[PDB]
Amino acid sequence: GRVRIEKMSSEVVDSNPYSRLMALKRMGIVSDYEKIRTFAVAIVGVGGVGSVTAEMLTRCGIGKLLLFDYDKVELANMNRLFFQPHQAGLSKVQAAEHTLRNINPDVLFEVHNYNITTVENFQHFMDRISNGGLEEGKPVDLVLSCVDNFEARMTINTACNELGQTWMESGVSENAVSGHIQLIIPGESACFACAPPLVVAANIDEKTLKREGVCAASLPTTMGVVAGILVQNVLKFLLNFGTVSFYLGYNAMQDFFPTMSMKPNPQCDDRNCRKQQEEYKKKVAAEEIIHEDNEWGIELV
Amino acid sequence: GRVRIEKMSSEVVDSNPYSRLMALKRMGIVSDYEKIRTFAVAIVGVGGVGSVTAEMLTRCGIGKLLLFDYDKVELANMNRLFFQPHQAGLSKVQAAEHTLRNINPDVLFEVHNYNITTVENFQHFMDRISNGGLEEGKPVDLVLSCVDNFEARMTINTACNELGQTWMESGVSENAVSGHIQLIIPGESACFACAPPLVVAANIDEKTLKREGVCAASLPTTMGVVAGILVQNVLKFLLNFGTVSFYLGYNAMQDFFPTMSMKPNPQCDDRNCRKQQEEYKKKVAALPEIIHEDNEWGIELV
Amino acid sequence: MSKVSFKITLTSDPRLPYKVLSVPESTPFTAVLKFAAEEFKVPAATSAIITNDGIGINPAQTAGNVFLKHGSELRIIP
Amino acid sequence: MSKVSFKITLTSDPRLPYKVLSVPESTPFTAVLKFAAEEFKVPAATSAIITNDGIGINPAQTAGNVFLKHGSELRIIP
Ligand SMILES: Nc1ncnc2c1ncn2[C@@H]1O[C@H](COP(=O)(O)OP(=O)(O)OP(=O)(O)O)[C@@H](O)[C@H]1O
Ligand SMILES: Nc1ncnc2c1ncn2[C@@H]1O[C@H](COP(=O)(O)OP(=O)(O)OP(=O)(O)O)[C@@H](O)[C@H]1O
Ligand SMILES: [Mg+2]
Ligand SMILES: [Mg+2]
Ligand SMILES: [Mg+2]
Ligand SMILES: [Mg+2]
Ligand SMILES: [Zn+2]
Ligand SMILES: [Zn+2]
């Protein structure tokens, strides 16, 4: 079976929501912008980062979004972008789907109001990653992790290592003023298990770190930056332009944005990561400028 | 639905929209977060960057926003954040004020649906910068320029040099993949006239560059990044935390974010800039280890 | 008669590449800015120029006067 | 008994500062990670560690084994 692909127009008129996007051809940045309509992206966590991420992808005209979150909108979330006070009490995925369909009815949505880490849900989650692509039965092009805990990150990690699914992970610090994105191509770059954070490594329940009546700080600025760089990386990856980052940090205090590349641990705790590394190493072993006006005789040494 | 809040509270409950913001005190990032309520910011241009900028400041609980834009929402703007398709045809400032008041009813708004560069409007614009602060008759704490043309930038420049008003300027490139922010403290850092772009310097009417039926490219990603760094700079400036940037660029193609510091031109074309530089140099010449709770393994630092 | 040389660095590229331009001193600096921008493939119209130390330059003056006031080491802000 | 030394660089600071740590070889590397994090004033619990070349390290191993597999030059990712 085929999926139909509709025609995105270049026409520069007030009524064309894709006019300023299709202008990326004319400006020579992206030769085949309309290809965005052919991709499906799964987003786990539609909170601070994930909601803005979903909106940015919706506005770009992504073919399909799959949203996973089990939480509800609260007024305490109103310091972040996207959700509005009248949506308080709704499920994040239902609120998001409604707003996003209004924003761009060309985008397909599939949403799941559940916790991806539990026994009941995990297999459905993996089924949706594998079969929830633009054409049913094909995988999603990318998974984006916008969750706020290591257990959920490890779950996505396990799933993607098993499926050989490329994904990107985002995080924001508890003090609100730093964040990062990372690209995980299982076998090619470090998985989350290759270099676990202290708490995961020391087998400490992350729940034990949470004192009641205290929350993480968050800022709409940091969310916007992190979502922006995440989705920019997504566009660069899917539409093949610019340089894809394997890791990009953000330190708001001093405006430092480090790039890095994390390489797989050959003795990674996740056996599928190890297997993927094996497959990867096997597969590996197998102008002159014109000046229209130069009447003053300037010359380049 | 949200209700007005008189005193900004740290209380970590689901119903407190300031809980995750006030947590910045506890975490020792910003000691006096609540001070945000005491400031007013003027935003010129409520488009791609300006709309998100207004939202971020509204969500933070800024005391007052003044919005200036003369344009209407169009569907062609739907590739960018903030505005929704049903708002097409409304004025950007009216649409924005309505959404933003719903988002945070604590924030005061004053909006102006006019072109700031015209002879009729310019004086009103300056009056509002000077008197449109949180208390009527006091100036705004900051002007943010989120416009898409040099004429409007030069207008804000002229006004701020005259008033001695600190402002920040943002821009995004025509190819959608680069942007920047800049802090202008008249006299202390470069004004827009200190180092004018080619078109301004060559006295070319920028209108002449614009071919009908071609538009600039824009991406919601770039808008989000640029607005995010702009408002981050605003918070750092107003709430005195971290390092304020005088210029911060963004090059999306290669993920390069250059910082710079632009210094005033002593022979700047704008005489008020020159005057401000003079006052500044005068005022300058007249101015006066780690504890580890648990170290049972005897690790030592060389 | 006289020529002046400028070393212009592109501030928007992480490599910070430069171009050295030889300019007849009477050339309006606006034409140098344009030439530099074209060399770096960034839009001429929107580019500005500062000194290596970050001082703003108004390019509506001769190359020669720019050279005398600022030296040869400059940075283009696209 | 025997000690190993690590040079740990903080990747999230533009100055890229480092700390040199002397560690008894039988110390679990998790305790080194913690010590380094505390030194750099970043949260221990959320920090990870990689080699200078970017290889992920699992810190649930002795300092001695980390040293043998990876050398002394490491980078903390807060
Ligand atoms: N196992 C999971 N399955 C699905 N979604 C998850 C899972 N773990 C976390 N998330 C989602 O990640 C989202 C993003 O985190 P974010 O911190 O912005 O929201 P929040 O937790 O509601 O905010 P706050 O931390 O201020 O309470 C949350 O909506 C959360 O429900
Ligand atoms: N002189 C001015 N006075 C008030 N607002 C202005 C002035 N000049 C520009 N602006 C505003 O700056 C805004 C930001 O530009 P942006 O490009 O995002 O919007 P746009 O021009 O409608 O979009 P597009 O360029 O795709 O048509 C516009 O809303 C514009 O009207
Ligand atoms: Mg919640
Ligand atoms: Mg959370
Ligand atoms: Mg318009
Ligand atoms: Mg415009
Ligand atoms: Zn691994
Ligand atoms: Zn000046």
mmCIF file of N, CA, C and O in Angstrom, chain B residues 188-191 194-195 261-266 277, chain C residues 50 52-57:
data_model
loop_
_atom_site.group_PDB
_atom_site.id
_atom_site.type_symbol
_atom_site.label_atom_id
_atom_site.label_comp_id
_atom_site.label_asym_id
_atom_site.label_seq_id
_atom_site.Cartn_x
_atom_site.Cartn_y
_atom_site.Cartn_z
ATOM 1 N N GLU B 188 27.738 53.532 26.050
ATOM 2 C CA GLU B 188 28.568 52.456 26.563
ATOM 3 C C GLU B 188 28.865 51.409 25.487
ATOM 4 O O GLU B 188 30.018 51.043 25.303
ATOM 5 N N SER B 189 27.851 50.921 24.759
ATOM 6 C CA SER B 189 28.128 49.993 23.660
ATOM 7 C C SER B 189 27.692 50.611 22.336
ATOM 8 O O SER B 189 26.953 51.587 22.348
ATOM 9 N N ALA B 190 28.124 50.029 21.209
ATOM 10 C CA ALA B 190 27.762 50.532 19.886
ATOM 11 C C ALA B 190 26.251 50.702 19.735
ATOM 12 O O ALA B 190 25.478 49.821 20.130
ATOM 13 N N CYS B 191 25.837 51.855 19.184
ATOM 14 C CA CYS B 191 24.454 52.035 18.770
ATOM 15 C C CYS B 191 24.358 51.509 17.340
ATOM 16 O O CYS B 191 25.389 51.174 16.757
ATOM 17 N N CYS B 194 26.470 53.598 15.077
ATOM 18 C CA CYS B 194 27.911 53.378 15.170
ATOM 19 C C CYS B 194 28.497 52.501 14.050
ATOM 20 O O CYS B 194 29.588 52.767 13.560
ATOM 21 N N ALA B 195 27.805 51.435 13.656
ATOM 22 C CA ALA B 195 28.333 50.552 12.631
ATOM 23 C C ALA B 195 27.196 50.155 11.706
ATOM 24 O O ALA B 195 26.678 49.047 11.798
ATOM 25 N N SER B 261 31.527 41.986 21.546
ATOM 26 C CA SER B 261 31.208 43.208 22.251
ATOM 27 C C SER B 261 31.442 44.352 21.270
ATOM 28 O O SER B 261 32.539 44.496 20.752
ATOM 29 N N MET B 262 30.385 45.084 20.924
ATOM 30 C CA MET B 262 30.510 46.147 19.938
ATOM 31 C C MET B 262 30.710 47.457 20.691
ATOM 32 O O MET B 262 29.920 47.803 21.577
ATOM 33 N N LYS B 263 31.771 48.177 20.326
ATOM 34 C CA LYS B 263 32.124 49.408 21.015
ATOM 35 C C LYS B 263 31.698 50.626 20.197
ATOM 36 O O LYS B 263 31.680 50.593 18.954
ATOM 37 N N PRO B 264 31.326 51.734 20.877
ATOM 38 C CA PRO B 264 30.858 52.927 20.191
ATOM 39 C C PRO B 264 31.916 53.512 19.256
ATOM 40 O O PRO B 264 33.116 53.425 19.490
ATOM 41 N N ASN B 265 31.419 54.065 18.157
ATOM 42 C CA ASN B 265 32.172 54.821 17.180
ATOM 43 C C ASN B 265 32.266 56.255 17.694
ATOM 44 O O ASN B 265 31.245 56.871 17.972
ATOM 45 N N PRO B 266 33.476 56.809 17.939
ATOM 46 C CA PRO B 266 33.578 58.136 18.550
ATOM 47 C C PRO B 266 33.075 59.221 17.600
ATOM 48 O O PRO B 266 32.667 60.290 18.048
ATOM 49 N N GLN B 277 28.314 58.949 24.675
ATOM 50 C CA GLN B 277 29.684 58.471 24.832
ATOM 51 C C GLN B 277 30.474 59.402 25.751
ATOM 52 O O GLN B 277 31.175 58.935 26.639
ATOM 53 N N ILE C 50 33.316 46.204 11.621
ATOM 54 C CA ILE C 50 33.904 46.708 12.861
ATOM 55 C C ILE C 50 35.413 46.455 12.840
ATOM 56 O O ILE C 50 35.902 45.677 12.023
ATOM 57 N N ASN C 52 39.051 45.068 14.585
ATOM 58 C CA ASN C 52 39.449 43.869 15.304
ATOM 59 C C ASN C 52 39.104 43.994 16.790
ATOM 60 O O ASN C 52 38.759 43.013 17.431
ATOM 61 N N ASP C 53 39.162 45.216 17.327
ATOM 62 C CA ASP C 53 38.866 45.475 18.730
ATOM 63 C C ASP C 53 37.381 45.748 18.978
ATOM 64 O O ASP C 53 37.007 46.061 20.110
ATOM 65 N N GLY C 54 36.553 45.715 17.920
ATOM 66 C CA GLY C 54 35.103 45.815 18.060
ATOM 67 C C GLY C 54 34.504 47.218 17.917
ATOM 68 O O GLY C 54 33.335 47.416 18.250
ATOM 69 N N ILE C 55 35.290 48.204 17.455
ATOM 70 C CA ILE C 55 34.773 49.556 17.273
ATOM 71 C C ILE C 55 33.976 49.591 15.976
ATOM 72 O O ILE C 55 34.444 49.096 14.937
ATOM 73 N N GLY C 56 32.778 50.187 16.062
ATOM 74 C CA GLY C 56 31.960 50.374 14.872
ATOM 75 C C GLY C 56 32.598 51.336 13.870
ATOM 76 O O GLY C 56 33.088 52.394 14.255
ATOM 77 N N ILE C 57 32.579 50.943 12.589
ATOM 78 C CA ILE C 57 33.019 51.773 11.479
ATOM 79 C C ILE C 57 31.806 52.163 10.620
ATOM 80 O O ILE C 57 30.975 51.326 10.258
#
